[PDB]
Design a protein around this ligand. Structure first.
Ligand SMILES: [N+]
Length: 57
């Protein structure tokens, strides 16, 4: 699966979200929504704002 780059820190604020740090390389799981993408960070999966990551490939 594709990788995305965290452009900002984001702290999860709902049970379906996940936290990321700027510079993190996240695995993209689902980009079907315009605003929230499902990613894998560490060993957690959840949603982060699509604007706060950049797809690499
Ligand atoms: N998290």
């Amino acid at each position: 699966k594709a990788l995305v780059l965290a452009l900002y820190d984001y702290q999860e604020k709902s049970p379906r979200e996940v936290t990321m740090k700027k510079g993190d390389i996240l695995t993209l799981l689902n980009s079907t929504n315009k605003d929230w993408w499902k990613v894998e960070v560490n060993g957690r999966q959840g949603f982060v704002p699509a604007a706060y990551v950049k797809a690499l490939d």
